[PDB]
Amino acid sequence: KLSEQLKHCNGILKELLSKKHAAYAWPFYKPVDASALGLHDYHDIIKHPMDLSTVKRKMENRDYRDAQEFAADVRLMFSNCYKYNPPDHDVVAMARKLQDVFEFRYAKMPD
Numbered sequence: 162k163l164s165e166q167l168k169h170c171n172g173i174l175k176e177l178l179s180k181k182h183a184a185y186a187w188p189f190y191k192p193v194d195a196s197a198l199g200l201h202d203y204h205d206i207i208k209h210p211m212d213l214s215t216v217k218r219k220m221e222n223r224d225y226r227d228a229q230e231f232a233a234d235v236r237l238m239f240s241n242c243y244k245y246n247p248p249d250h251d252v253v254a255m256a257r258k259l260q261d262v263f264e265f266r267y268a269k270m271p272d
């Protein structure tokens with residue numbers, strides 16, 4: 162965590178990693194293993210990979226200085242999914258659902 166707004170961000174992160182959302186969050190838990198998934202163009206198309214384990218390490222290391230920096234990494238993770246995948250792939254449906262969880266709770270940021 163860190164500041165009051167970063168504690169709200171840390172709360173969101175814990176929720177995104179929780180059993181509550183595991184049915185659609187699991188593709189975002191760890192970095193995409195492009196080689197393992199046969200996605201040999203992944204790193205040509207996605208210049209800045211991002212995933213929830215990386216967000217968690219950056220939060221634990223007090224890398225994020227504000228909520229905006231945290232949100233930019235979470236949205237980068239979703240954007241990468243929308244950029245690489247055809248819009249009818251199950252992983253895109255899962256990204257949309259997890260981003261809905263993220264955006265509605267991020268909007269409840271304490272001022």
Ligand SMILES: CNC(=O)c1cc(C(=O)N[C@H]2C[C@@H]2C)cc(Cc2ccccc2)n1
Nearest residue numbers: 188189193198242245246247250251252255
């Ligand atoms: C963040 N993960 C991913 O982007 C990803 C991508 C692909 C994948 O194969 N993409 C291909 C279709 C483009 C060309 C597969 C998975 C794993 C997965 C499988 C089934 C259901 C949810 C996830 N994750």
